[PDB]
Design an enzyme around this catalytic site. Structure first.
Site, PDB file in Angstrom:
ATOM      1  N   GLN B  11       0.806  -1.272   0.055  1.00 55.68           N
ATOM      2  CA  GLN B  11      -0.114  -0.046   0.035  1.00 55.68           C
ATOM      3  C   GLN B  11       1.003   1.308   0.001  1.00 55.68           C
ATOM      4  OE1 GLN B  11      -3.428   0.626   2.586  1.00 55.68           O
ATOM      5  NE2 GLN B  11      -2.832   2.762   2.704  1.00 55.68           N
ATOM      6  N   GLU B  67      -2.761  -7.532  -1.863  1.00 59.71           N
ATOM      7  CA  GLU B  67      -4.134  -7.398  -1.314  1.00 59.71           C
ATOM      8  C   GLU B  67      -4.949  -6.467  -2.680  1.00 59.71           C
ATOM      9  OE1 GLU B  67      -5.844  -7.688   2.016  1.00 59.71           O
ATOM     10  OE2 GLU B  67      -7.602  -7.402   0.617  1.00 59.71           O
ATOM     11  N   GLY B 140       3.649  -6.313   4.884  1.00 64.45           N
ATOM     12  CA  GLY B 140       3.616  -7.682   4.515  1.00 64.45           C
ATOM     13  C   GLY B 140       4.004  -7.735   3.141  1.00 64.45           C
ATOM     14  N   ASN B 202       9.577   7.181   8.948  1.00 62.17           N
ATOM     15  CA  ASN B 202       8.057   7.901   9.205  1.00 62.17           C
ATOM     16  C   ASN B 202       8.260   8.896  10.481  1.00 62.17           C
ATOM     17  OD1 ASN B 202       6.637   7.372   7.163  1.00 62.17           O
ATOM     18  ND2 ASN B 202       5.691   5.946   8.148  1.00 62.17           N
ATOM     19  N   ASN B 224       2.730  11.535   2.893  1.00 61.14           N
ATOM     20  CA  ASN B 224       3.128  11.251   1.542  1.00 61.14           C
ATOM     21  C   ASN B 224       3.355  12.220   0.638  1.00 61.14           C
ATOM     22  OD1 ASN B 224       2.914   8.789   2.214  1.00 61.14           O
ATOM     23  ND2 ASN B 224       0.911   8.310   1.730  1.00 61.14           N
ATOM     24  N   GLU B 250      26.069   6.985 -12.538  1.00 60.83           N
ATOM     25  CA  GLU B 250      26.842   7.891 -11.643  1.00 60.83           C
ATOM     26  C   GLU B 250      26.510   7.993 -10.303  1.00 60.83           C
ATOM     27  OE1 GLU B 250      29.635   9.725 -12.958  1.00 60.83           O
ATOM     28  OE2 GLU B 250      29.169   8.343 -14.524  1.00 60.83           O
TER      29      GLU B 250
HETATM   30  N1  LIG Z   1       4.928   7.308   5.025  1.00 61.53           N
HETATM   31  C1  LIG Z   1       3.910   6.335   4.855  1.00 61.53           C
HETATM   32  N2  LIG Z   1       3.984   5.152   5.524  1.00 61.53           N
HETATM   33  C2  LIG Z   1       3.035   4.387   5.549  1.00 61.53           C
HETATM   34  C3  LIG Z   1       1.837   4.529   4.749  1.00 61.53           C
HETATM   35  N3  LIG Z   1       1.219   3.304   5.035  1.00 61.53           N
HETATM   36  C4  LIG Z   1       1.668   2.339   5.679  1.00 61.53           C
HETATM   37  N4  LIG Z   1       2.650   3.094   6.032  1.00 61.53           N
HETATM   38  C5  LIG Z   1       3.704   2.566   7.199  1.00 61.53           C
HETATM   39  O1  LIG Z   1       3.958   1.331   6.478  1.00 61.53           O
HETATM   40  C6  LIG Z   1       3.632   0.232   7.502  1.00 61.53           C
HETATM   41  C7  LIG Z   1       3.103  -0.821   6.764  1.00 61.53           C
HETATM   42  O2  LIG Z   1       2.655  -0.404   5.363  1.00 61.53           O
HETATM   43  P1  LIG Z   1       1.889  -1.294   4.315  1.00 61.53           P
HETATM   44  O3  LIG Z   1       1.871  -0.421   3.190  1.00 61.53           O
HETATM   45  O4  LIG Z   1       0.334  -1.352   4.884  1.00 61.53           O
HETATM   46  O5  LIG Z   1       2.364  -2.591   4.092  1.00 61.53           O
HETATM   47  P2  LIG Z   1       1.715  -3.664   3.344  1.00 61.53           P
HETATM   48  O6  LIG Z   1       2.472  -4.383   2.363  1.00 61.53           O
HETATM   49  O7  LIG Z   1       0.537  -2.985   2.726  1.00 61.53           O
HETATM   50  O8  LIG Z   1       1.040  -4.287   4.608  1.00 61.53           O
HETATM   51  P3  LIG Z   1      -0.124  -5.468   4.027  1.00 61.53           P
HETATM   52  O9  LIG Z   1      -1.163  -4.642   3.693  1.00 61.53           O
HETATM   53  O10 LIG Z   1       0.052  -6.567   5.357  1.00 61.53           O
HETATM   54  O11 LIG Z   1       0.540  -6.098   2.872  1.00 61.53           O
HETATM   55  C8  LIG Z   1       2.747   1.075   8.518  1.00 61.53           C
HETATM   56  O12 LIG Z   1       3.013   0.369   9.538  1.00 61.53           O
HETATM   57  C9  LIG Z   1       3.519   2.239   8.816  1.00 61.53           C
HETATM   58  O13 LIG Z   1       4.498   2.308   9.256  1.00 61.53           O
HETATM   59  C10 LIG Z   1       1.844   5.744   4.082  1.00 61.53           C
HETATM   60  O14 LIG Z   1       0.955   5.850   3.375  1.00 61.53           O
HETATM   61  N5  LIG Z   1       2.812   6.567   4.144  1.00 61.53           N
END
Ligand SMILES: Nc1nc2c(ncn2[C@@H]2O[C@H](COP(=O)(O)OP(=O)(O)OP(=O)(O)O)[C@@H](O)[C@H]2O)c(=O)[nH]1
Ligand SMILES: Nc1nc2c(ncn2[C@@H]2O[C@H](COP(=O)(O)OP(=O)(O)OP(=O)(O)O)[C@@H](O)[C@H]2O)c(=O)[nH]1
Lengths: 422, 423
Positions: B11, B67, B140, B202, B224, B250
């Site tokens: 995501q 997902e 994940g 973050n 973001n 480079e």
């Molecule tokens: N900067 C930023 N960090 C994010 C964002 N979304 C999630 N995070 C961080 O990323 C972690 C997990 O992010 P995900 O993108 O959900 O990872 P994922 O692969 O989608 O996880 P699954 O849904 O289980 O597959 C979160 O606990 C936050 O620490 C985002 O939009 N921006």
């Protein structure tokens, strides 16, 4: 895409789920029963199938009781699809072993055919939710063969359960221990998580906070429904943390066999709507984490938490939430220093009948006091009669109860150890 | 060609990408939807887009997730019809905050479609320069598929350069209690497979949004915006004709003095604006200084205390070369550089600007303080691993304690290697 099949088993399962379904329908803008799309909102698809100009609760209704659950035919009518209601030739009593004997297989397969249909209509299964009582021939006597068969056919699909433990009161059948412990055995062994709701807690809450003179069973069911509705809400209305059912299981259960969770919700409101409901974040947090509102009757203010999470439903200031939650962290404490152990999330949809609501879930080691009570029933029964004397014909053999108590003791003991070690 | 292919995984990866692609479109004066050209196309769109015979420019990007939600909403609703519909790839069940699923469980099957479709995409390039992957580290699919994909890319494309841009698990905004486990497993995989990587924390990002931008209660959507703009400057040199960085090749010479010490911190400034004041501080020296101050550094590390191993400042817009040069005099000497690396601060400038700013810039900093980030994650890893918490969610898919221990040790060695350069 992560949809949930809901299984309701036995009388308790059906009355509780009925209340749940009405409330969830309201939140998503679906009229109950005549499930028309009155401005439908939220991720409706997780719990309802959509055919068109209709929304069908994705539910399996199970009752060993003879005949049919007209209790649904008359009370909900078109809310539930009749092809999803399963029964057999005859019923069962308050004995777990009857649910497990006398050709119960005919209904176990029929239940499984229905389950296969609710699964096959769904693009992807994000888990199962099973609601049932622990004290009787169907709630657990049948509900636990369901729990087992589901994991056998869907091994990677998490099962999250809600279950009702009978009042310590012995007014109920005195074979309850034989049910309760076999029920725990299968819950420890097969569920991914479970919420332990103790009727004693629901009862004392109704007496003390909801001002109910003599709580009836139908009143307790509303506390339950409010907990189910709010707990499930994080899976329906997207908020600040992207949680789903599988992820909840992972965040609150650090070890296998320590997956019994407490639940609490506030403000707790019954259908009478006697009071105006407005609270600040600070008042609301202090109550949800107090002993007064814990549905497991466990006093988790004197033990320690292993993992926990709080969702705020409604519009609440972030500044106030963080101060309120700081106060909580100083009032209690957490185990093995899981550094990430406590989560706070928010979602804007107001739960109806309230300005602001809060859900708290936790894995806390005081939860074993429920298990200590069940064990106590065994120790008294077996110190007087170590024979499983209610099981001399069609019941379980001692070895089965050996298995069941062994497993229960491991749960109790592991909680105690982890807390003391930290 | 000198084309670049981007992968966005999970995501956070896909949402940050979606924003990147909106902004890159603006920079080239290419329209967001349908990817049309507003008559006059700016820069060199070939770095990131393929040119259809109908004039449509098609971003060379794959959105990947386990997902099937984020892929669907970006490809069909947020930037409808922008992305090539065959490069949207998704599984049927998500992971659940578990590296193990994304890397060894569901995902290990999916990887054959991911790599076949990538093969179809690289085959369209006249000449591919490299891949850039954007992903969450501690998730994940992000962690898991990201690392699986990275391994396969290096095996399949050994001579192309693999960069990764990735988001670290700050405890302040976390969806996963196990996030640190996934982080150390993912960082291990990256040490063994990427050629360069940029680390965004973050935690820091939160601090920036909170105090520089004046935005109360940051949510992922705000974090973001900062990310997207930073990422847009980093790859800007590949989009417009300029000096300094002009090729992924480079980058790997100037910013990575050791094959195993390639983790970079990044800064970006001005962080858009406060919606008051001015769009940018125009003094060249304020921009130059900003890039080395703690408030613009997405790593939450004061670079003042430590050793710089490499530094590259890309300026954009109206900045005069001589003013930059003068500005650098008050920076060198505030900060220390490694005795074993003769290279000083490299800098240069591309005469374009992000829409709305007179001047702006960013910096890639290879610096010993990166170790502090690794050390925070490792401390969490150690408290949890040592009591066996949550290990059953990984062993159930095939990842035993031995792999966790391996990953821990390799990440600790990385941290120790950087610590030696502080002397
Ligand atoms: N900067 C930023 N960090 C994010 C964002 N979304 C999630 N995070 C961080 O990323 C972690 C997990 O992010 P995900 O993108 O959900 O990872 P994922 O692969 O989608 O996880 P699954 O849904 O289980 O597959 C979160 O606990 C936050 O620490 C985002 O939009 N921006
Ligand atoms: N909280 C709560 N408790 C219930 C509810 N329904 C029944 N109980 C309690 O649960 C026990 C009965 O559980 P069940 O398994 O559903 O009873 P049953 O097996 O369906 O009994 P039969 O209908 O005679 O077959 C008793 O101790 C009741 O006090 C309910 O809806 N809510």
């Amino acid at each position: 895409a992560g949809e949930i099949v809901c299984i309701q088993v036995g009388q308790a399962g059906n009355q509780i789920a009925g209340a749940f379904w009405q409330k969830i329908c309201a939140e998503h803008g679906i009229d109950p029963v005549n499930g028309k799309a009155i401005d439908v909102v939220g991720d409706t698809d997780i719990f309802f199938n959509t055919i068109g100009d209709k929304y069908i609760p994705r539910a399996v209704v199970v009752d060993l009781e003879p005949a049919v659950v007209e209790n649904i035919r008359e009370k909900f009518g078109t809310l539930f699809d009749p092809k999803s209601i399963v029964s057999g030739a005859d019923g069962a009593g308050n004995n777990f072993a009857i649910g497990f004997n006398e050709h119960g297989a005919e209904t176990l397969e029929k239940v499984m055919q229905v389950v296969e249909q609710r699964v096959s209509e769904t693009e992807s299964i994000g888990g199962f939710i099973l609601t049932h009582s622990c004290g009787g021939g169907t709630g657990s006597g049948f509900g636990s063969k369901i729990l087992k068969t589901i994991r056998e056919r869907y091994p990677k699909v998490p099962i999250f359960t809600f279950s009702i433990f009978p009042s310590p009161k012995i007014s109920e059948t005195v074979v309850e221990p034989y049910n309760a412990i076999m029920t725990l055995s299968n819950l420890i062994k097969y569920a991914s998580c479970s919420i332990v709701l103790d009727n004693e807690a629901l009862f004392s809450i109704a007496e003390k906070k909801l001002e109910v003179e003599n709580p009836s069973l139908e009143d307790l069911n509303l506390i339950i429904a409010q907990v189910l509705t709010n707990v499930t809400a994080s899976l329906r209305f997207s908020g600040t943390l992207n949680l789903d059912l599988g992820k909840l299981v992972t965040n609150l259960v650090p070890f296998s066999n320590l997956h019994f969770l407490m639940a609490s919700t506030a403000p707790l409101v019954l259908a009478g709507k006697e009071s105006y409901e407005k609270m600040t974040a600070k008042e609301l947090s202090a109550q949800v984490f107090g002993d007064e509102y814990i549905c497991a009757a466990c006093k988790p203010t004197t033990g320690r938490y292993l993992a926990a999470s709080v969702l705020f439903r409604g519009a609440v200031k972030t500044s106030d939430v963080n101060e309120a939650m700081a106060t909580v962290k100083e009032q209690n404490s957490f185990v093995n220093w899981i550094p990430t152990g406590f989560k706070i999330s928010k979602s804007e949809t107001s739960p109806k009948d309230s300005a602001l609501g809060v859900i708290m879930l936790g894995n806390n080691s005081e939860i074993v006091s429920v298990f200590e009570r069940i064990g106590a029933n065994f120790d008294r029964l077996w110190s007087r009669k170590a024979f499983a004397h209610w099981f001399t014909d069609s019941g379980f053999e001692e070895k089965d109860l050996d298995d069941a108590r062994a497993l229960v003791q491991k749960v109790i003991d592991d909680y105690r150890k982890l807390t003391e070690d930290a | 060609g000198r084309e670049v292919i981007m992968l966005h995984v999970g995501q956070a990866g896909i949402q940050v990408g979606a924003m990147y692609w909106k902004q890159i479109c603006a920079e080239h004066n290419l329209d967001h939807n349908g990817a049309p050209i507003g008559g006059d196309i700016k820069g060199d769109p070939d770095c990131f887009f393929m040119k259809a015979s109908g004039g449509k420019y098609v971003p060379r990007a794959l959105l990947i997730d386990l997902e099937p939600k984020v892929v669907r909403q970006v490809g069909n609703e947020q930037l409808p019809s922008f992305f090539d519909p065959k490069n949207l790839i998704h599984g049927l069940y998500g992971g659940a905050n578990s590296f193990a699923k994304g890397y060894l469980g569901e995902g290990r099957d999916m990887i054959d479609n991911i790599m076949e479709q990538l093969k179809k995409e690289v085959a369209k390039c006249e000449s591919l320069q490299g891949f850039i992957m954007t992903h969450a580290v501690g998730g994940g699919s992000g962690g898991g598929l990201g690392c699986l994909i990275m391994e396969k890319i290096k095996e399949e494309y050994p001579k192309k350069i693999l960069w990764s841009y990735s988001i670290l698990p700050s405890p302040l905004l976390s969806d996963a209690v196990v996030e640190p486990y996934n982080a150390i497993l993912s960082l291990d995989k990256m040490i063994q497979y990427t050629d360069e990587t940029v680390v965004i924390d973050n935690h820091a990002l939160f601090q920036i949004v909170t105090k520089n931008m004046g935005i109360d209660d940051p949510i992922y959507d705000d974090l973001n915006h900062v990310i997207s703009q930073a990422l847009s400057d980093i790859t800007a040199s590949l989009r417009f004709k300029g000096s300094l960085n002009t090729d992924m090749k480079e980058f790997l010479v100037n910013l990575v003095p050791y094959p195993r010490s390639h983790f970079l911190m990044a800064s970006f400034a001005p962080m858009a604006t406060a919606e008051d004041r001015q769009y940018a501080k125009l003094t060249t020296s304020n921009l130059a200084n900003a890039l080395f101050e703690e408030n613009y550094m997405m790593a939450a590390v004061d670079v003042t205390k430590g050793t710089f191993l490499a530094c590259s400042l890309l300026f954009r817009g109206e900045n005069t070369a001589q003013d930059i040069t003068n500005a650098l005099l008050d920076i060198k000497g505030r900060i220390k550089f490694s005795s074993f690396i003769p290279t000083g601060i490299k800098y240069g400038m591309t005469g374009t600007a992000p829409e709305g700013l007179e001047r702006s810039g960013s910096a890639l900093i290879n610096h010993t303080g990166v170790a502090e980030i690794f050390n925070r994650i490792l401390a969490q890893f150690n408290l949890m691993f040592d009591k066996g918490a949550f290990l059953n969610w990984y062993e159930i898919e095939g990842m035993s304690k031995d792999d966790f221990a391996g990953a821990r040790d390799n990440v600790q060695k990385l941290s120790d290697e950087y610590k030696r350069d502080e002397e």
